[PDB]
Every structure is written in C-alpha cells, then in structure tokens.
C-alpha cells in the first residue's frame, strides 16, 4: 500500500495562483473564443463558463476545466496569459516572477 505525488509545472500554477489569477484575470470570453477556435473548449465546456453568475465566477470555472483536460490544454491555456498579457494590465509582474518563456528572440 503506497503512493506518490503529482506534478504538472503548468496545471500547478494554475492551482496555485487559482486565487490570483481570478483576481488578476478579467477577459473569460477571449480565453474561450481562442481556445473554441484552436478546438481545445467544446460547447459544453463554453456553456458551462457562460453559465456562471460573474465573472470572478468564469475565470474559476475555466481554470477547473483546463485543469480537467491535462497539460495539453493547460500549457496552451498558460500561453495566451502571455501573448495577450501584452493587452492586460493586472497581469505582467506575474509572468516575470514565474517565467513562463526562455531563451533570447533573435534568429
């Protein structure tokens, strides 16, 4: 009778700052619109988002599902926290602690 740990670098800074991130995060519907059209969110997944009451309600409700799915969808749906983080003003120093990209831009 023994057991180990889990692990997942993406999904655990999803659990983590799951607190921060709907404190942070505003934007639900362009989480869902990105990941509806990389076919990453189904229109069950979307309807359950939409379903919730506010928004700090959809920012949970997402992070519970992408962490459902698997790192697949989590590294994906870390990523646009960066690419659009360039649009956001609550998320910047975040990504700079955690360090999510690496390596120089040149080439």
């Given at each position: 009778g023994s057991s180990g740990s889990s692990g997942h670098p993406h999904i655990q800074l999803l659990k983590s700052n799951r607190e921060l991130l709907v404190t942070?995060?505003?934007?639900?519907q362009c989480l869902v619109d990105n990941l509806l059209k990389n076919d990453y969110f189904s229109a069950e997944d979307a309807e359950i988002v939409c379903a919730c009451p506010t928004q700090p309600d959809k920012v949970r409700k997402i992070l519970d599902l992408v962490q459902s799915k698997g790192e697949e969808v989590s590294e994906f749906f870390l990523y646009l926290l960066q690419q659009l983080a360039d649009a956001y003003?609550?998320?910047?120093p975040w990504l700079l602690e955690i360090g999510f990209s690496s390596g120089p831009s040149s080439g």
């Open positions: 942070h995060i505003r934007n639900t003003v609550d998320l910047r």
